Amino acid sequence: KKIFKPEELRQALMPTLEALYRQDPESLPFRQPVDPQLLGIPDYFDIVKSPMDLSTIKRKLDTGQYQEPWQYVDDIWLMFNNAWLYNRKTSRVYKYCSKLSEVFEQEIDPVMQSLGYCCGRKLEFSPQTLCCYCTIPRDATYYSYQNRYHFCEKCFNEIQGESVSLGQTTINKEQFSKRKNDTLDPELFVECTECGRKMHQICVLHHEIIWPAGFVCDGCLKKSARTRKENKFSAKRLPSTRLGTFLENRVNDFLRRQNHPESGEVTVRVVHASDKTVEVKPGMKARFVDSGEMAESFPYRTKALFAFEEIDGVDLCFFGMHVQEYGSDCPPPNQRRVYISYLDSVHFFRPKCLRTAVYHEILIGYLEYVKKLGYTTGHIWACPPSEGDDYIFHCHPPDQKIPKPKRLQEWFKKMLDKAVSERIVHDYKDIFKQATEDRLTSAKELPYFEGDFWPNVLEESIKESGGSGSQKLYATMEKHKEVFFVIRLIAGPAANSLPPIVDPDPLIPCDLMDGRDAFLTLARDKHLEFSSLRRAQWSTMCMLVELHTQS
Ligand SMILES: CCCC(=O)SCCNC(=O)CCNC(=O)[C@H](O)C(C)(C)COP(=O)(O)OP(=O)(O)OC[C@H]1O[C@@H](n2cnc3c(N)ncnc32)[C@H](O)[C@@H]1OP(=O)(O)O
Ligand SMILES: [Cl-]
Numbered sequence: 001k002k003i004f005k006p007e008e009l010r011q012a013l014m015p016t017l018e019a020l021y022r023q024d025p026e027s028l029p030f031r032q033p034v035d036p037q038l039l040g041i042p043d044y045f046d047i048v049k050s051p052m053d054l055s056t057i058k059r060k061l062d063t064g065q066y067q068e069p070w071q072y073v074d075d076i077w078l079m080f081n082n083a084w085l086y087n088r089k090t091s092r093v094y095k096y097c098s099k100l101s102e103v104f105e106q107e108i109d110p111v112m113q114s115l116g117y118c119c120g121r122k123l124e125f126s127p128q129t130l131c132c133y134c135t136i137p138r139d140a141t142y143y144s145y146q147n148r149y150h151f152c153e154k155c156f157n158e159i160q161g162e163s164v165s166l167g168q169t170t171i172n173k174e175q176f177s178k179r180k181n182d183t184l185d186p187e188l189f190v191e192c193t194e195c196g197r198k199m200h201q202i203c204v205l206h207h208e209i210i211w212p213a214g215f216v217c218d219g220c221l222k223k224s225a226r227t228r229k230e231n232k233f234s235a236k237r238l239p240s241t242r243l244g245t246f247l248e249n250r251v252n253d254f255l256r257r258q259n260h261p262e263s264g265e266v267t268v269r270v271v272h273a274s275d276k277t278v279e280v281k282p283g284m285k286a287r288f289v290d291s292g293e294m295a296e297s298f299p300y301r302t303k304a305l306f307a308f309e310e311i312d313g314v315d316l317c318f319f320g321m322h323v324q325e326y327g328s329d330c331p332p333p334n335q336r337r338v339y340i341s342y343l344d345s346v347h348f349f350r351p352k353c354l355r356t357a358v359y360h361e362i363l364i365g366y367l368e369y370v371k372k373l374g375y376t377t378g379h380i381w382a383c384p385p386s387e388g389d390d391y392i393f394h395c396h397p398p399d400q401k402i403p404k405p406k407r408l409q410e411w412f413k414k415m416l417d418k419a420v421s422e423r424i425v426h427d428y429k430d431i432f433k434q435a436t437e438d439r440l441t442s443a444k445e446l447p448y449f450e451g452d453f454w455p456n457v458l459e460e461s462i463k464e465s466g467g468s469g470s471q472k473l474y475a476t477m478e479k480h481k482e483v484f485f486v487i488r489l490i491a492g493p494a495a496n497s498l499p500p501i502v503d504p505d506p507l508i509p510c511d512l513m514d515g516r517d518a519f520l521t522l523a524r525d526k527h528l529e530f531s532s533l534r535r536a537q538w539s540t541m542c543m544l545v546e547l548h549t550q551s
């Protein structure tokens, strides 16, 4: 419907092209079509298969060859990427190109918005981290087979001879692709069904399941005084639980007491609950299970929960956590214990000044809740994610700093100190002090949680020592003590005569949220990043559809 008259486009876009032209000397290399012979570059057309330059763009613009402004934008970016492709990162033309692109980004965005568009930005997804069958860096050369087995240029030539082994089968090095990790997937567009304008799907938050009749831009809606049909796939409409309700009430009551300007309501939902078992690993099993001194496995309930806030009228998932709950039927040493498998956040909560406080309220609430059920003890491993890894949310904002261990430890201490002052937590200790207090003598007495540090270090210890599970145990606990919190919820004689633990909430099947892996995999496979407010809002919207529809 919306026809851009060629003069309309010329008038609107030519100032953005002039802005590039008037950059001296940066513009000069881009003002005329590359003549490879004259320029003393014969191999230019071996690399650059779609040449483009300012004159060609000016001409297409003057002669009405563009039907819509994104076609202009694509040519501009083709020109830039042609130069970034052919020239070295350290070269003259490369840096000139970079300068022009910065001028262009600043010029183009408000123009595109004047023409009725979401924005004028060129948007691409973050590059995935490539492992090594070690990790491969952005833009640096690497070797791959079936887009499945990749090797960094160093550890590839490390391999002696001409044959690699995958799995087992043997592959000649000549069968590997040599390539640079410089591939970035563009963001997708959706077309307004009325005016025909192409908009970033993430800018407009159009999801085909939620609005199956098709996308209609805000411009077109406002002209006829319409509004979008309600999004029924919201965080609020996910099923309530006793736990979720309790946590969200605690949070919102806290926010209401603070009365900070521009506070929003928080929604907390439990989205997974299932019964699982942790199996004792082979070292510890040979040592204690086979002689009947320790259970071969421990049953627990896993739960996944998320907190959401409305930001700019749209749901935003900002906090996530998975927990392991070992009930009263579980064998010692795990009986009546909870362990935090992992928690994660995306730092867009508003207001900023209460973000940490809100995370603390969620954790204190959770401790309070399980205490009420009759869980006696909480367990926290203060372990930051490894470099460029994510616990729950794929692709964090690059400006969200990741705490190192000391900061993270102090953060848990501040939470627990508040919990103590509220008389929820009786006390807490590091693992070494706790073991001392419990007169622990053997490794079989240490709580054994899925994915935790202690099961792994005990395997290593038994093997290193040639059969002892407990020789250096106090020394290992002392050495790592600052990182391991044991939290006493129910203290002393009362902890010995408790009734059975009965959880009033039902099980909640949801394979997507059975541990962290499935949601990380989904997010990676569908470009669901949490790396900016807009991408997190999209990713939240998609997550919520998935949670509503898989149920
Ligand atoms: C077995 C695992 C069990 C667990 O899951 S233990 C927790 C492991 N999970 C993670 O670390 C997930 C990634 N981290 C997060 O989502 C968050 O950092 C977390 C843990 C929820 C806490 O968030 P926040 O309450 O916002 O506290 P914070 O320490 O992250 O940030 C508060 C202020 O400290 C700053 N900060 C954090 N790391 C820093 C650094 N490395 N260098 C310098 N500054 C740093 C941060 O920028 C912030 O400053 P500001 O007050 O906003 O100016
Ligand atoms: Cl999607």
Ligand SMILES: [Zn+2]
Pocket: 118, 119, 120, 121, 199, 200, 203
């Ligand atoms: Zn946009």
Ligand SMILES: [Zn+2]
Pocket: 132, 134, 135, 151, 152, 153, 154, 155, 156
């Ligand atoms: Zn490598």
Ligand SMILES: [Zn+2]
Pocket: 192, 193, 194, 195, 196, 197, 216, 217, 218, 219, 220
């Ligand atoms: Zn429209």
Ligand SMILES: [Zn+2]
Pocket: 260, 351, 353
């Ligand atoms: Zn404030």
